[PDB]
Amino acid sequence: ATFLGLSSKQEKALVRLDKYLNLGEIAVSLVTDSATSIKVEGRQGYYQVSYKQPHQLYRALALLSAALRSGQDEVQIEEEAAYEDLAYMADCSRNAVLNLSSAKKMIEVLALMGYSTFELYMEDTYEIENQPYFGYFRGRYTVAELQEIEDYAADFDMSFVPCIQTLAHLSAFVKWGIKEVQELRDVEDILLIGEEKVYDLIEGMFQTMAHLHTRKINIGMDEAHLVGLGRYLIKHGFQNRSLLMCQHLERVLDIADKYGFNCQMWSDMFFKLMSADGQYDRDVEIPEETRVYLDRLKERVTLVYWDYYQDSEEKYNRNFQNHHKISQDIAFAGGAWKWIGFTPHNHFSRLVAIEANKACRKNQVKEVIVTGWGDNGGETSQFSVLPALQIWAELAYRNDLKKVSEHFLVSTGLDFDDFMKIDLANLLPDLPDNLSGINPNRYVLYQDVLCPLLEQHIRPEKDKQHFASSAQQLGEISKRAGEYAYIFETQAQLNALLALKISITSGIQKAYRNGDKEHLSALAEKDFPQLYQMVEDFSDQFSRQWQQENKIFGLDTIDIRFGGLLKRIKRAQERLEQFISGQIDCVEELEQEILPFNDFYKDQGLTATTANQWHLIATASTIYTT
Template sequence: MTMSSCTAISCEGGMELRLVDMLTALGEEYPIFTKQPGALRVRFVRQENASLAKAVRTGDEVVIHYSTLQQAARFVGSAQAGLIDEGEHTERFSFEKLAFMICAAHNKVFTVTHIQKWLRRMALFGFNQMLLYVDDTYEVQGEPFFGYMRGRYTAKEIQAIDAYAARLGIELVPAIQTLGHLSQLVRWPAYKNVQDTRAVILADEEATYKLIEKMIAFWKQNTRAGRIHLGMDEAHDLGRGVFMDKHGPKPAFDIFNRHLGRVVSICEKHSLEPMIWSDMYFRMGSPSRQDYYDPATVIPPEVKAAIPAQAQLVYWDYYHHDKAFYKDWIARHKALGKEPVVASAAWTWSNLWHNADMTEKAAKPCIEVSIAENVRNLIVTMWGDDGSTCDFDSAMLGFAFCAEQAFAHDSFDRGRMARRFEAVTGANYAAHMIAAEINSTPLSPMCILWDNPVYHMYLHNAQLVQNCDLGKEARRFEGIHHRLSEMQLDSAAGNLWHAAGIAKYMAMRLNFADSLFAAWPARNRQSLDRLWRQSFELAGATDELAESFRSSWFACAKPFGLEVIQMRLAAIALQFRELARRLRQYLDGQVETLDELDANIDPPKGVFGPFRFSHIFTACDDIRK
């Protein structure tokens, strides 16, 4: 791999075995042990300070004083980026654990090789923990339908990931689900005996805990993990399905705490320290029982007292931009008698490309407050809701930003962050920031993508209800495509050719919709004839975009789940061809009007959503979960 922005270094001198092993792993991608002339010579000296490390440069030699592999890797990344000038440089490691999370639960399951690439890069950014988020995408002994046809990880694959992470000084923490988010599991008849509602499994049921023990045992047997994330978030209808049929209505707090207690006991049996997402306590205490961030939330004292002492709470927040809110919510977690783990995010869900603007607006205050409030563990997540349409590698920019905030929050320098990003990933920072502008619009690019071109429910609402200028937004996407086309594009941290193609396609879709919305009410036959021809062009462009998605997918992930995106794009292409047929029928006088176009000239005045394919593509039944 050619890293034009990466300084060649030569690691020399006597080194402890674990350091040699880490550098050897990094050397699979980077010029670590090069003998080329002019390479920066790097030596390592052990120290005892785990919270402060330093590097001293004298001429063409750098001496890295480190206690942990995390410190050593972070400074190796600095050396590669040319960030260590003459003299002494120190960095404070504010968090005991700085974690990144890979989402392998929403169709896109990274290959082992690709996770290893992520591990190398995240180590050089300064992360020392990885959460691997899975719902049911791992194998469980004696459970053939667990993760069936979902690209589940085998024991051998998890062992390989765990071993490689350890070489880089990164702790692998399994992040599973033991209550909600298990709709893909309980869809199978084999699990009807442990199903409460559509996505929540049945509390107070012995068969449930036998299954959960198998799940937890898998991770204990195949990793070095000393801790495990049990999930348990967003179980909104807990106790309202089969549970209520069996036991009658019971307080949700009681059901939740009992269930958590049982699962924590299983963790203790397997010598694992458990953590859970904290939102259910706050939701159950809210008058709406839905709002995680409701200031009116009240968690009764008896509920606090019943929370298992061993369970660590993870406060996740990807949405707030003001420090005051983070400070308040961290304090509320501490009031529960817990020192919380805090989770921010690189914005990938419901996006086609990493949303750098949203990442920075939420992560910056979150990380700053976490440091000020002496939070010891920070997680930076990413998610793949509604099919993992995002090019996850594009989120490396978000992880680079969050790492820089964690290490240099009081002296953050975007130029230094950009140099590290380019050296570590080999990608073009300026091009990535242009690609991220795909998300800088009042419209949702993913909703534009999934909007049925016959009905245009989303774009009709955006234009007529939200007063969005579709032509203006089309020109903005054209500008993004033009600027990207002028740059040297790469796929080192997200496929920039794919991003350019998305921008071009968005412009085509918006121009088409804008023209159709003007031409049809006026029955402008000349414009409608032109739109008839363009319908075929857009069907072909949709097919091309599907090929681009396919290439990006196979560059990083197992094949399972790609069919969801392919199915959706095939449906969009088919609808463009159907629209062409219908327009031709009207233009040839075979029909007096087109009911499907008439029906949405005056769309309902109200909030449109939720923004998922099944709700955007059609209002008819049969494709919703």
């Protein structure tokens, strides 16, 4: 293609995106018109493109590419985005730290989808002068690495916004038994409000980020549940904790002002500290003294309402109404579900996005942040939720999903419906589709064999057959997934592994109860070696995926988890062999009645459940406690 009206900056960006766009022998004219977010119009080899915000050039060009690729000659496209800013936030604090090559790839894809902003969530995973323990052995980013990521986003006229922590969610830092670290603590994962050494630390954080061009930052402050109740209480006695939050907020904003920064924060603590049962989804009455303090501070910070779960527009609406009693400046954070094990939930992400979009439009939201959390070890691929990201982009620009396939093809090179099958290890038959967090991908994998804590939540025949069928389907998809084949290979192997693991685990329970030693012997001699090899092979494929996407640091926890499971499979074989041979008269583990693991979904009546903490899936014994 040839172009009129490009800058040298835009030429350079187009060279990098040519591999996605492949525009052919056409002529494209960029015009100045800023009437709508995007316009594309033409026929017979001549097309005119215009954009409102500079970054919007790259979605406009993706739309042209997609129309032409679909076989259209006449093109007439006009879009008006509902949101001034649309961001993706990757988690870099849950053990997986995105490597530079992968950040750059993500940035390119986001540019084509239409996102204005790339964000990284960093609790302790950046360097601070004279803080050697902050990020120690975690793969913390150097200033030079943050600048390289920022600058690459800036080449596409995209913003960069660090998401850090200035109160809680600092467990990886506060664990160090060094007096200069321990003096910074209140309780659990929370820093000590009012301690000058804590404000020294926080100013260090801003000194690091001041080396960037960006002056927009998310300062955190979510989920500080016991704030004011630890060393704070021992030093100062019991205080008004809503006021305490405001005091700390104002200290942090004054530091931010010194370095020229404008701030956003997670909103949940205001609601939790002022509601009678301590919950977020609550209409709260605010004490006048707190009212007055907040009213002053809401001029100087943007509150972010985060919600990844509700299935209806009105449920979001109630929360926006609650928030608007405090401030007009409310941003929204939705969820691209990739924090429930090894397998994402793009389907569920789609369901809630449709409803959250409706609410955000009804409540005049200017900014939406799509979050990509990695809870409890970062086990899901960094690229697992591309479909959910295209979904939010389509909702933001068109208010519908009618073109999601057409456009996705340009962003990834593969079919949207194929890619959605990445979810299969969570899509059990008959599950009601409005229930969140149902993650058998993870808990079927990590549960023990001798003492299977999740067994009452498994339908042995029904679920096994689903996993086996899903393995088949993913094997064929990976053949046509191109640069993404590796992530589909990972899911194909996981599904095959889960099928065999159910077959063996459930077979043992049945055979032991019936006294069928012949069956137990068949399992021990043939099926156990097969399961063990399939686990080792899965560990190898997963390490492949991890090292493609992430820094090496953090892989160590997954090695511990997989190594433990392997040693437990060997134990199960050994115990059964001793029972079959008569060396022991019973297997006490197999004589225990298995109970429901939890009752979270008892009253929705279903068999599967949510279980998302490895150390609680893997054993009923103590493991981290004294």
